[PDB]
Amino acid sequence: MDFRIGQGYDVHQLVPGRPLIIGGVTIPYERGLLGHSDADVLLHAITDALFGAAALGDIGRHFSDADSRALLRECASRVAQAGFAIRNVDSTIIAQAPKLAPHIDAMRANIAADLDLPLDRVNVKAKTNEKLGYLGRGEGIEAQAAALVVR
Amino acid sequence: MDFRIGQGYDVHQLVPGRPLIIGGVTIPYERGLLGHSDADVLLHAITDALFGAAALGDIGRHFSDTDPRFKGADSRALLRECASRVAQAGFAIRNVDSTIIAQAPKLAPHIDAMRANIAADLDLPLDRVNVKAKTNEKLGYLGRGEGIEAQAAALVVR
Amino acid sequence: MDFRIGQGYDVHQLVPGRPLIIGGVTIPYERGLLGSDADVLLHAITDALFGAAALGDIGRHFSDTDKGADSRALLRECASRVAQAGFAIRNVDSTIIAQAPKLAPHIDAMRANIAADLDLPLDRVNVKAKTNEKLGYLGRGEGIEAQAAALVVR
Ligand SMILES: OCc1cn2ccsc2n1
Ligand SMILES: OCc1cn2ccsc2n1
Ligand SMILES: OCc1cn2ccsc2n1
Ligand SMILES: Nc1ccnc(=O)[nH]1
Ligand SMILES: Nc1ccnc(=O)[nH]1
Ligand SMILES: Nc1ccnc(=O)[nH]1
Ligand SMILES: [Zn+2]
Ligand SMILES: [Zn+2]
Ligand SMILES: [Zn+2]
């Protein structure tokens, strides 16, 4: 019936002395993402896609720059409050390193639990940047997301 | 229930001596976006998402940067023509979402006005239109303030 | 009804010595993409189809070991796995970002290839072309990016 689509984008720098947390998963690595929160680039992109589908603005407006899962849960709350139900989420992480493949199902599990969705409605994809640009040089990590909701 | 989705992308350089026009809003700034038309990166991205959802090709095709009739073209006029062609193809627009990526200036004070322009041009209520603002966290040409990028998504139904 | 959306991204470097193949179409150029055929557009569309189906990604379905298959063979196999998970493809839209060469003359051919491979009416497949306005590695002609979106229904 009243379907809406949303899209999200995020990028953070990789810096020494920070933990690397993506999709709620702490991944062993010598650098981590820099941000005012835990800098979970994946969760932020999904969050923006959800706000965007519900026409509620953006993550910058809702949570002025701690735990990104808490923010994702709050986002899901605001989406429900606006009268929408989430139908599915898809996403991509662009990181030259480290290897993300072993952690993906954990990420999906986290996101599914945070959005109160079954696993089959949550997806997370991994890509390198084929050594191009700042992502290619491992200076940051990007995430992209898409969300479908219904009123 | 014949739904279709589309996506769009655009980027333009930020240069001295040009109006900064994003989402139809003239924003006070010392630089502006360089292009053949008014170079409204956000409206272009949305226009491409709508043409894309309707499988009508793209804005480069409909409103060519090689055709002199679009020199300094009002991108809201282009967006309204896109919406007309989308309607004529048989599609109704259900919603639009978008992102602008810029180091500067601060876009937040202008976002609501952008949403209102897009809503007006697409004949949608405000609650079916969204615009989001992002920095690029200081990375790359966007982080260096060399250009501004926009992304869009649209849902339509035949 | 049970609609789902998916999105996809891909980028390959652009250097002398390889054919330029985008959307199944070989395009005369002084350079080409590095990868198989390195078909950036087919890869992104393949990723958006798997993501709409919540089946992971092209890296997981089609790794470097398992044959030699070109990117259209992968798109078709992608499409068959999507169907067995219960989903029908409703449409695909995409954008190729390349500073050069001119892609517009080749779009009809890419759409035809994609629609054939996905068994879709032509009017549910779209491909768009963008430059990067001379910004970044894309704008210096050091690589080509593709973006895709797909809608499916169970
Ligand atoms: O652009 C990086 C970024 C800023 N911000 C504010 C809330 S979540 C988030 N990610
Ligand atoms: O890539 C910048 C660009 C080209 N073009 C043609 C019509 S609107 C527009 N934006
Ligand atoms: O990053 C370029 C790339 C990697 N990969 C794996 C399967 S298809 C494909 N394209
Ligand atoms: N960093 C990564 C990129 C792509 N695939 C992975 O598994 N990891
Ligand atoms: N350029 C901007 C990025 C993020 N937020 C803003 O308000 N403006
Ligand atoms: N490389 C290209 C970018 C934009 N339009 C084209 O036709 N080709
Ligand atoms: Zn973030
Ligand atoms: Zn433009
Ligand atoms: Zn590829």
Q: Which residues of C touch B34 (CB under 8 A)?
A: 133
Instruction: Tell me the residue ranges of DSSP E strands in chain B.
Output: 3-16, 20-22, 25-27, 31-33, 92-101, 132-134, 147-157
DSSP string, A33-76: E-SSS---HHHHHHHHHHHHHTT---HHHHS----HHHHHHHHH
Kindly tell me the burial class for residue B138, based on how many C-beta atoms sit within 10 Å of its own C-beta (0-12, 13-18, 19 or more): middle
CB contact under 8 A, A3 and C8: no
User: Resolution limit in angstroms?
Assistant: 1.8
* A96 in a known ligand binding site: yes
CB contact under 8 A, C126 and B5: no
CATH class of B1-158: alpha beta
CATH class of C1-154: alpha beta
CB contact under 8 A, C50 and A130: no
Pocket of ligand 6 (CB under 6 A): B 60; C 98, 100, 102-104, 129-131
Annotated binding-site ranges of C: 10-12, 36, 43, 57-59, 62-66, 98-104, 129-133, 140
Q: Which tokens in the block code for residue C27? A: 């395009």
Method used to solve the structure? X-ray
Kindly tell me the burial class for residue A147, based on how many C-beta atoms sit within 10 Å of its own C-beta (0-12, 13-18, 19 or more): buried
- Cα distances (Å, whole numbers) of residue A82 to A8, A50, B98: 19, 11, 19
Phi and psi at C102, nearest 5°, equal: -60, 120
Q: Which tokens in the block code for residue A3? A: 């379907």
Please tell me the distance from the alpha carbon of residue A116 to that of residue A75, in angstroms, as a whole number. Answer: 12
Query: Is residue B46 a contact partner of residue B58, using CB atoms and an 8 Å limit?
Result: no
Residue C107 sits at the chain B interface (C-beta within 8 Å)? yes
Please tell me the distance from the alpha carbon of residue B147 to that of residue B118, in angstroms, as a whole number. Answer: 22
- Cα distances (Å, whole numbers) of residue C27 to C14, C107, C131: 13, 11, 16
Q: Amino acid letter at B85?
A: R
DSSP string, B3-29: EEEEEEEEEEEEEETS-EEETTEEE--
Phi and psi at C81, nearest 5°, equal: -65, -35
Residue C57 sits at the chain A interface (C-beta within 8 Å)? yes
Q: What angle do CA C115, C119, C123 make, to 5 degrees?
A: 45
Please tell me the distance from the alpha carbon of residue B156 to that of residue B96, in angstroms, as a whole number. Answer: 9
Q: How far is B8 from chain C (nearest CA, A)?
A: 7
Please tell me the distance from the alpha carbon of residue A20 to that of residue A25, in angstroms, as a whole number. Answer: 8
CB contact under 8 A, B53 and C128: no
Q: What angle do CA C81, C87, C90 make, to 5 degrees?
A: 115
Which among A103, A101, A100, A97 is positioned nearest to A138, based on CA atoms? Answer: A97
Domain limits, chain A: 1-151
Neighbours of C71 (CB within 10 A): 26
Q: Does CATH number 3.30.1330.50 belong to domain A1-151? A: yes
Q: Which tokens in the block code for residue C148? A: 């895709």
